[PDB]
Design a binder for this molecule. Structure first.
Ligand SMILES: Nc1ncnc2c1ncn2[C@@H]1O[C@H](COP(=O)(O)OP(=O)(O)OP(=O)(O)O)[C@@H](O)[C@H]1O
Ligand SMILES: Nc1ncnc2c1ncn2[C@@H]1O[C@H](COP(=O)(O)OP(=O)(O)OP(=O)(O)O)[C@@H](O)[C@H]1O
Lengths: 296, 695, 192
């Protein structure tokens, strides 16, 4: 059960709805999609790394601090300072889960959370009749994020040792491809390092009664009724197009899929499944929904 | 008349006699308020209903002692209601005090201000108001089942600054309109609770013995209800098209009117009056309703229908959550500060029943609909909705229609055909006042929602408050123009300004409020009304001399967009004018940025005092502007070399800047002041900001 | 399946102006050092290599908008000041950007209206990385011939704005080609 640390050194576009949108972290959907596409480009075998690997979402880091999302847990006291907060570092996470975090501490933690800044870079497209005759340029915009020299994102993955060796090989392949949007236009390369942090391991290997969903999951048909007994959760319409399925890219677009967010809390665990969002295509297109649980 | 309507029409006029006694020129019965009000109402044909007269004439203990009324007579509920809403020398000239002083007076008690320094009212004013209300009462008011909202509106129009109780020993901050409204609300709630819970001889249920009376205060006969729009931000700020100005003023308004129609329709279901609405704005609404099984069953069913609708069009972008909590009338009289406990409890229940939003079968249905769909509206960043011509769906085009129709027409109508799609199988179209009338005698089941216009008195006249201002119509062409219509200003760079503001101390103010002594339902209600009316009229007036169009304003959110210079000037003006109205008790935090024209406005929104006014704008900016005005040839080149020296904070650069200023031809005073400022860090940052503003 | 890496450094022979701000030049919003975007390299290279002649243009950069879909086979990244240029300019105390004053002459009037255009300093060096995803073994020679001819053209052309007016001339030095994925040899491929 190793974790991967990602350093970029080139600004990245990650996207939610429009190319001028900017997002900091991405979900296991896009990550698993990227690993799948690089496995196919390598021409390796896909069965091994389809139904054995569990991936958590991306989570940012700073110099020596690692971050996990806020559990949507019901704290009984402001209801303001906690709302403006998204992420809680590993040092104070058990403190948060047990009410040992104070409002001034919330303000301080928010104050220290400078881990990147946003930007819109302008661009123009002169493939149009500006080649031919008097015709206006068509400026467009892209949304980017840049990390300070000691920031990045990290993963948490688990599985058999063989699965993790394969994951290492594919990640080596991927570091020179991208992990974002306009990869081919100069955004989103990275170098990765595998480090074993004692504290994160301790946090991952507890035992409790609740569960904090660290990835984006959706229970299968026959478990959802007992899965949703007592829970606090946010759903997100996850959409997007597909790469090399049919003739027209504009005509091909995955059916919308809803999954629980990366902070939901549950009583009864559910295993997930890799769900097809496929139709009118030549090959199946996969979306990822399998949880990585944090048990406390 | 229905007995509930009898409670309504009687209660809202229980303390009417006060305005009559305080008049002095109308004191026919100089004995008590009750008898005088009874005599006054007793000349008019429409309000010639008798039980209403009894209600008004008997609103107090002593009078009721001998009226020999039935064990069921509506006035008794009026008595308990006035007590709930609530040595006694009433000075007719007592000036009303603004609640905003008392709020943060605990820390800093300032000289109690007052409405119209040491102002005082005068006798003839009340006589004039008597004339006015007799005029309206002969010519505008009429008694039918459905005119109660109209009566409430006229009370609102006439009374909002006539002091309710003028007791010299009490902190006078309640308008008589507030007292009357909350009394009517409480009366309605009591009537439903008693009628439902199988009690009929109310004289014996309540009045008989103070111990039994005190029990009734203790019984949990009231429910407080809450509302919350879930997905405000992502619905309002998903725009990329060329009609950015036109849509936003219309999308914001469509969401607002959605909230209003939801709350009105709910009130219609529960057979309650518009008085029971205590606060609307943003996404929240608070309702005070009856604590019966019937009401709760209806609430559950209505929540079901609403959630099914909102899934049937949006599925994540907008959802509504409601929650209610039992509360006892003893808690409304600020007995143990427990009002604050119950209010926080209902807030927590809302914030924790927004967690579990969708049932199992619901989330299955969301995921298993393989449907032939087209793609994302250029104007409205949404895929699920079904586009048409120009890559736009029907909803976005209806929004564009209402956008075009906003500027010239004022009345808004809820009907079966309309243009835009409303929750419970309704639609909205747009009309004019003559057209509104024509619909009125047509007796169509209509509601009129207006553009901050009273003196309507037309059908269901519902003066809904929304700040619609746009300098873009002050040009030679009255038609609404694009976002470039402010970009093209030549007095500076051709850029846009956007301003966002939040009240810093607003969570505490609605929750904590004034400690330990003014924490009733009445006093927090009047504070709510004051803030609401401030953000829904005062902005409209304050923004007049400014080239700004008002986008979304209300609650505690201030979202204005316009020309760069104008946004700064208007922001300063608004901050000062607010500090005036809140008597320097509440503070505002605001951000203004420079955004280029033709950016997707969805993206500029996600980007976004005494010190700035006195030190930067007033002194440094003025001397700098005079300096450049006196000496020509100081183009952007000279200023930008000044920047080049300044931003690199080095002493060799200070010498270089000295050389540059020496080579300029400014007066010795200007150069000397600039150099002295340049030697100091705080001053030089301020100087940088000021000269940047010059450009 | 191998990935070929084309790395090197480019010198600004005459001042450079990408100017996404306009008339500022593109920078990084924290480091405040100028950059040269990958989009600029790719766009100018594509325009040149296409005007030189098509299927090869589709091959190298990938269009996938004409009823058939081709995945990009050359990935171009941004460039940044090297440590060497930074240290040299610091020691000799040279600012990173020059500002040229310009002017325009009206006809029948002969009044001059001046402008102010910012320009990257001569001698600055940018470090770049390209990637070649060799999806077909039997075409790497042809594709590096094409990229050779493209770089040769860019050597004799300009990047950014105002090149007809005398700026943007660049140079390419210190190019090395290494194979970083797979087992394909690259000790014979050549780029100036
Ligand atoms: N039409 C509107 N346009 C812009 N801002 C609005 C509009 N209506 C309300 N707002 C403001 O936007 C704020 C943010 O709304 P938001 O989307 O956060 O919803 P919310 O009610 O706070 O729910 P949640 O807790 O789920 O965020 C509201 O508190 C309100 O002040
Ligand atoms: N007059 C009012 N009465 C009650 N609640 C109000 C009123 N005006 C605004 N609100 C509340 O304020 C919310 C807006 O939240 P927003 O994030 O804009 O600021 P806030 O959290 O209230 O302010 P702050 O954190 O500075 O105290 C609304 O959703 C609503 O619940």
């Amino acid at each position: 059960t190793k974790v991967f640390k990602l350093s970029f050194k080139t600004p990245v576009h990650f996207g939610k709805k429009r190319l001028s949108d900017g997002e900091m972290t991405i979900t296991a959907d896009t990550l698993f999609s990227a690993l799948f596409i690089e496995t196919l480009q390598l021409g390796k075998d896909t069965d091994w790394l389809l139904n054995d690997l569990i991936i958590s979402d991306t989570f940012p880091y700073e110099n020596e601090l690692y971050y996990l999302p806020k559990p949507l847990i019901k704290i009984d006291s402001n209801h303001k300072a906690f709302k403006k907060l998204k992420y809680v570092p590993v040092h104070h996470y058990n403190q948060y889960l047990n009410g040992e975090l104070s409002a001034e501490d919330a303000t301080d933690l928010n104050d220290i959370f400078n881990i990147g800044y946003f930007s819109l870079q302008t661009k123009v497209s002169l493939i149009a009749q500006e080649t031919d005759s008097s015709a206006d340029s068509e400026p467009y915009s892209v949304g980017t994020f840049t990390f300070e020299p000691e920031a990045g994102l990290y993963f948490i993955a688990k599985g058999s040792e063989e699965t993790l060796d394969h994951l290492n090989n594919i990640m080596t392949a991927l570091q020179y491809s991208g992990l974002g949007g306009k990869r081919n236009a100069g955004y989103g390369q990275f170098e990765y390092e595998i480090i074993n942090n004692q504290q994160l391991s301790k946090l991952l290997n507890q035992n409790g009664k609740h569960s904090i969903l660290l990835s984006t999951a959706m229970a299968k048909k026959e478990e959802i009724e007992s899965a949703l007994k007592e829970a606090r959760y946010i759903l997100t319409k996850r959409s997007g197009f597909v790469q090399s399925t049919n003739y027209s890219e504009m005509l091909v677009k995955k059916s919308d899929f809803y999954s629980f967010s990366s902070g939901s809390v549950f009583k009864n665990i559910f295993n997930g499944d890799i769900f097809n969002v496929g139709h009118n295509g030549k090959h199946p297109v996969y979306r990822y929904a399998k949880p990585l649980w944090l048990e406390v | 008349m229905n007995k509930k309507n009898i409670l309504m029409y009687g209660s809202l006029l229980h303390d009417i006699g006060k305005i009559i006694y305080r008049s002095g020129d109308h004191t026919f019965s100089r004995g008590t308020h009750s008898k005088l009000g009874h005599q006054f109402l007793s000349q008019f044909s429409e309000f010639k209903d008798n039980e209403v007269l009894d209600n008004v004439a008997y609103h107090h203990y002593k009078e009721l002692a001998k009226a020999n009324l039935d064990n069921d007579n509506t006035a008794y509920i009026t008595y308990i209601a006035d007590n709930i809403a609530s040595l006694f020398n009433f000075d007719k000239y007592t000036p009303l005090y603004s609640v905003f002083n008392i709020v943060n007076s605990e820390k800093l008690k300032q000289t109690n201000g007052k409405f119209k320094e040491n102002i005082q009212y005068s006798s003839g004013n009340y006589t004039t108001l008597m004339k006015d209300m007799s005029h309206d009462l002969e010519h505008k008011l009429s008694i039918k089942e459905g005119t109660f909202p109209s009566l409430l509106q006229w009370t609102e129009s006439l009374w909002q600054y006539v002091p309710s109780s003028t007791n010299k020993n009490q902190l006078i901050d309640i308008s008589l309109y507030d007292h009357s409204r909350i009394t009517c609300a409480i009366a309605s709630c009591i009537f439903d609770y008693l009628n439902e819970n199988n009690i009929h001889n109310y004289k014996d249920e309540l009045f008989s013995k103070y111990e039994n009376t005190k029990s009734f205060y203790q019984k949990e006969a009231f429910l407080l209800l809450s509302m919350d729009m879930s997905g405000i931000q992502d619905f309002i700020y998903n725009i990329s098209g060329s009609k950015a100005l036109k849509s936003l003023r219309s999308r914001s308004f469509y969401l607002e009117l959605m909230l209003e129609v939801i709350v009105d329709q709910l009130l219609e279901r529960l057979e309650l009056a518009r008085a029971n609405l205590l606060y609307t704005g943003g996404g929240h609404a608070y309702l005070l309703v009856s604590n019966t099984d019937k009401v709760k069953k209806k609430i559950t069913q209505f929540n079901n229908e609403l959630k099914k609708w909102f899934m049937s069009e949006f599925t994540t972008d907008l959802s509504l959550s409601m929650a209610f909590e039992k509360c006892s009338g003893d808690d409304l009289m600020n007995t143990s500060g427990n009002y604050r406990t119950i209010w926080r409890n209902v807030s927590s229940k809302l914030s924790d029943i927004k967690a579990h939003k969708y049932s199992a079968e619901d989330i299955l249905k969301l995921n298993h609909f393989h449907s032939y769909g087209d793609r994302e509206c250029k104007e409205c960043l949404r895929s699920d909705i079904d586009i048409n011509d120009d890559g736009l769906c029907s909803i976005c085009e209806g929004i564009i229609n209402i956008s075009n129709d906003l500027r010239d027409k004022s009345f808004f109508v809820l009907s079966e055909t309309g243009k835009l799609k409303m929750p419970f199988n309704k639609f909205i179209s747009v009309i004019d006042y003559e057209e509104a009338e024509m619909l009125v005698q047509n007796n169509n089941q209509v509601r009129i929602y207006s553009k901050n216009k009273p003196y309507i008195g037309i059908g269901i006249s519902t003066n809904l408050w929304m700040c619609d201002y746009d300098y873009a119509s002050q040009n030679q062409d009255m038609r609404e123009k694009g976002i470039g219509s402010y970009v093209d200003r030549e007095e500076g760079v051709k850029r846009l300004g956007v301003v966002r503001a939040d009240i810093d101390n607003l969570g505490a103010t609605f929750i904590s409020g004034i400690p330990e002594k003014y924490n009733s339902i009445s006093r927090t209600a009047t504070l709510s009304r004051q803030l609401s009316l401030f953000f829904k009229y005062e902005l409209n007036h304050l923004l007049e001399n400014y080239q700004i169009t008002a986008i979304y304003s209300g609650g505690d959110d201030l979202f204005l967009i316009g020309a760069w210079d104008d946004i700064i000037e208007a922001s300063i003006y608004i901050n000062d004018k607010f500090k005036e109205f809140t008597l320097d008790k509440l503070t505002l935090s605001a951000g203004v940025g420079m955004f280029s024209g033709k950016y997707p406005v969805s993206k500029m929104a996600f980007e976004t005092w005494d010190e700035f006014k006195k030190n930067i704008l007033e002194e440094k900016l003025l001397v700098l502007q005079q300096g450049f005005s006196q000496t020509d040839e100081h183009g952007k080149a000279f200023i930008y070399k000044m920047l080049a020296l300044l931003r690199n904070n080095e002493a060799i650069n200070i010498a270089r800047l000295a050389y540059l200023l020496a080579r300029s031809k400014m007066n010795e005073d200007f150069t000397s002041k600039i150099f002295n400022w340049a030697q100091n860090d705080k001053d030089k940052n301020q100087l940088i900001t000021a000269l940047e503003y010059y450009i | 399946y191998s990935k070929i890496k084309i790395s090197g450094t480019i010198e600004v022979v005459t001042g450079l102006h990408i100017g996404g701000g306009g008339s500022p030049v593109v920078r990084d919003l924290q480091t405040k050092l100028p950059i040269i975007p990958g989009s600029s390299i790719k766009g100018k290279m594509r325009n040149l290599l296409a005007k030189h002649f098509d299927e090869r243009v589709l091959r190298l950069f990938g269009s996938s908008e004409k009823g058939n879909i081709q995945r990009a086979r050359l990935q171009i990244s941004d460039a940044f000041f090297s440590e060497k240029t930074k240290e040299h300019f610091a020691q000799n105390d040279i600012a990173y950007t020059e500002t040229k004053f310009e002017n325009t002459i009206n006809r029948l009037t002969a009044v001059a209206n001046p402008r102010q255009i910012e320009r990257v300093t001569r001698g600055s060096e940018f470090d770049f990385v390209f990637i070649y995803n060799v999806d077909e073994e039997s075409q790497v020679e042809d594709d590096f011939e094409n990229i050779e001819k493209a770089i040769h053209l860019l050597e004799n052309d300009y990047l950014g704005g105002g090149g007809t007016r005398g700026n943007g001339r660049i140079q390419f030095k210190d190019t090395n080609i290494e194979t970083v994925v797979g087992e394909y040899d690259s000790t014979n491929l050549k780029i100036k």
